[PDB]
Every structure is written in structure tokens, then in C-alpha cells.
Swiss-Prot record:
Belongs to the ARTD/PARP family. Residues 24-227 form the PARP catalytic domain. The chain holds residues 946 to 1162 of 1166 of the full protein. Disulfide bonds: none annotated. Highly expressed in placenta, skeletal muscle, liver, brain, kidney, heart, thymus, spinal cord, lung, peripheral blood leukocytes, pancreas, lymph nodes, spleen, prostate, testis, ovary, small intestine, colon, mammary gland, breast and breast carcinoma, and in common-type meningioma. Highly expressed in fetal liver, heart and brain. It is found in: Cytoplasm; Golgi apparatus membrane; Nucleus; Chromosome, Telomere. Poly-ADP-ribosyltransferase involved in various processes such as Wnt signaling pathway, telomere length and vesicle trafficking. Acts as an activator of the Wnt signaling pathway by mediating poly-ADP-ribosylation of AXIN1 and AXIN2, 2 key components of the beta-catenin destruction complex: poly-ADP-ribosylated target proteins are recognized by RNF146, which mediates their ubiquitination and subsequent degradation. Also mediates poly-ADP-ribosylation of BLZF1 and CASC3, followed by recruitment of RNF146 and subsequent ubiquitination. This is Poly [ADP-ribose] polymerase tankyrase-2. Ubiquitinated at 'Lys-48' and 'Lys-63' by RNF146 when auto-poly-ADP-ribosylated; this leads to degradation. Deubiquitinated by USP25; leading to stabilization. ADP-ribosylated (-auto). Poly-ADP-ribosylated protein is recognized by RNF146, followed by ubiquitination. Oligomerizes and associates with TNKS. Interacts with the cytoplasmic domain of LNPEP/Otase in SLC2A4/GLUT4-vesicles. Binds to the N-terminus of Grb14 and TRF1 with its ankyrin repeat region. Interacts with HIF1AN. Interacts with RNF146; this interaction leads to ubiquitination and proteasomal degradation. Interacts with NUMA1. Changing residue 119 to V: Loss of activity. It comes from Homo sapiens. It comes from the Eukaryota. Zn(2+) binds at residues 146, 149, 154, 157.
Length: 227
């Protein structure tokens, strides 16, 4: 596509203030995000042990997260990374899943709530594939599942993902485990690459919460296959 759907300028809400904007399914912005959500689903190695067993989702809502402070903090970081990387910010849309969605869209991503015991250390993790971020909606490795039924493969409870503007800058390409506290020298993010005897699907790690904007809030639920 050659239309500017994902990377439009944000305008002053008022603001306090996180305001959600309801996108109608007839809008091409809704449809693009929906299709990106649906088409990037892969068959996982766990057998769906973490994210659940599915092929597609039931997209219920796609809202656009509008926050003045979070925006004028992302742009400042983006401009900074750009200047340190030959005017190339390396911005792209990536999925994100965590139990902290409500906090992320009100306060922004927060590195100080990282993990350090992750594959690439104390960073905030993003994915090309929507079904990968889905494995982290109810916590690391799926956690105990949905709060109501304790089911990691629940088709009843509604879930939320984030489709985010991510500034990658000069990304450090890694195959093996490399537990970082910050982005490696000269770089601004880490890219986990697919490889045999390693990762099956890619992943992208930043170490500054200001380096990502939670543009799209997706309310969905995984769908039972037939059968
Ligand atoms: C299993 S793994 O691949 O290594 C892996 C590791 C880490 C992540 C990963 N990537 N991003 C996050 C969380 C980001 C975040 N931003 N703000 C918050 C927050 C805000 C307020 C409060 C309060 N009160 C708590 C948190 O969180 N996480 C994460 C961190 C700890 C626990 C679970 C997860 Cl998903 N994703 C995957
Ligand atoms: N929490 C996530 O969305 C995520 C994305 C990629 C890898 N690990 C976790
Ligand atoms: Zn449930």
C-alpha cells in the first residue's frame, strides 16, 4: 500500500488525557489493521499451549489511542534516534501483548517494568506476528489463562492487543540469547531473528518506552476452528 494509514500526524485532543477514537469497519484504516492482524497468524511450536488454538480472530473493536503527552514524547525520541541513525528512524508497525494494556495506553510503555530474565533482557518486546504477541496477553507464557476460566485457550473472554508505531533505529541483529539491560552500543533496538535450533518467529526489543507508541488498540477474541 502507498497510502499513509499507519503513520499520520496526531492532533491535539485537548488534552488530559487518553482519548480513544472508534474506527468504523468501513474505514480503510480499520480494515488494514484487521487484515494485518488476521494474516500474520502462524502455527506455533507449543501446540497453542500459551496463546490458544486458533486460525483467526473475531475482531470486535479497533480504537485509535490519542494521548498528547505520550505522542510528544514518542516524536522527541524518534527525532533523536533518527539523528543518531543518518536521518533513518526505522519506524514500523509491530504487535504487542501484555497484561498491562490499560497502563500502556494511559502512561506509555515503561521499561522499569521489564523482565531482565527474558531472551534479550530488560526490554519491551514486539512481534511481526499477531499470534505471537497473543501468547503474552494473559502474562508470560500465557500465565494462568483468562481471569474467569483459567483457560489459556479461551474463546469466551475478550482480549486486547496493541498495534504499535515502533522506532527501531539501527537495530542489532541477534540469533542467540543476549540478555541486555540497554540497547547495544551504537544501536537503538534488538531484532531476534528466526533460525533452526532457535527462534521460529522474529521479535523486536526496545529498551525505552518512549520509543514506541500504542497507536491501535485491538479488542478481539480467538476463534474455535472446525474442528
Ligand atoms: C517471555 S519473554 O519473551 O522473554 C518476554 C519478556 C517481556 C515481555 C514484555 N514486553 N513488554 C512488557 C511490559 C511492558 C510494560 N509497559 N508498562 C508496563 C507496566 C505499567 C504499570 C504497571 C503497574 N502497576 C506494570 C507494568 O509494562 N513485557 C512484560 C514484562 C513483565 C511481565 C510480562 C510482560 Cl509481557 N514480553 C515477553
Ligand atoms: N509481548 C509481546 O507482544 C512479545 C512479542 C514478541 C516476543 N515476545 C513477546
Ligand atoms: Zn475466559
Amino acid at each position: 500500500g502507498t497510502e499513509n494509514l499507519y503513520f499520520q500526524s496526531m492532533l491535539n485532543t485537548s488534552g488530559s488525557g487518553t482519548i480513544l477514537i472508534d474506527l468504523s469497519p468501513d474505514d480503510k484504516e480499520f480494515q488494514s489493521v484487521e487484515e494485518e492482524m488476521q494474516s500474520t497468524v502462524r502455527e506455533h511450536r507449543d501446540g497453542g499451549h500459551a496463546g490458544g488454538i486458533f486460525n483467526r480472530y473475531n475482531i470486535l473493536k479497533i480504537q485509535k489511542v490519542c494521548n498528547k503527552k505520550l505522542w510528544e514524547r514518542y516524536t522527541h525520541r524518534r527525532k533523536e534516534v533518527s539523528e543518531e541513525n543518518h536521518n533513518h528512524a526505522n519506524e514500523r508497525m509491530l504487535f504487542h501483548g501484555s497484561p498491562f494494556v490499560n497502563a500502556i495506553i494511559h502512561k506509555g510503555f515503561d521499561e522499569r517494568h521489564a523482565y531482565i530474565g527474558g531472551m534479550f533482557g530488560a526490554g519491551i518486546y514486539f512481534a511481526e506476528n499477531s499470534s505471537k504477541s497473543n501468547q503474552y496477553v494473559y502474562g508470560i507464557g500465557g500465565g494462568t489463562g483468562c481471569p474467569v476460566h483459567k483457560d489459556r485457550s479461551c474463546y469466551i473472554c475478550h482480549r486486547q492487543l496493541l498495534f504499535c508505531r515502533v522506532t527501531l533505529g539501527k537495530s542489532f541483529l541477534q540469533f542467540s540469547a543476549m540478555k541486555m539491560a540497554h540497547s547495544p552500543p551504537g544501536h537503538h533496538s534488538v531484532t531476534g531473528r528466526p533460525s533452526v535450533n532457535g527462534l521460529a518467529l522474529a521479535e523486536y526489543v526496545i529498551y525505552r518506552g518512549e520509543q514506541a507508541y500504542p497507536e491501535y488498540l485491538i479488542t478481539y477474541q480467538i476463534m474455535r476452528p472446525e474442528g
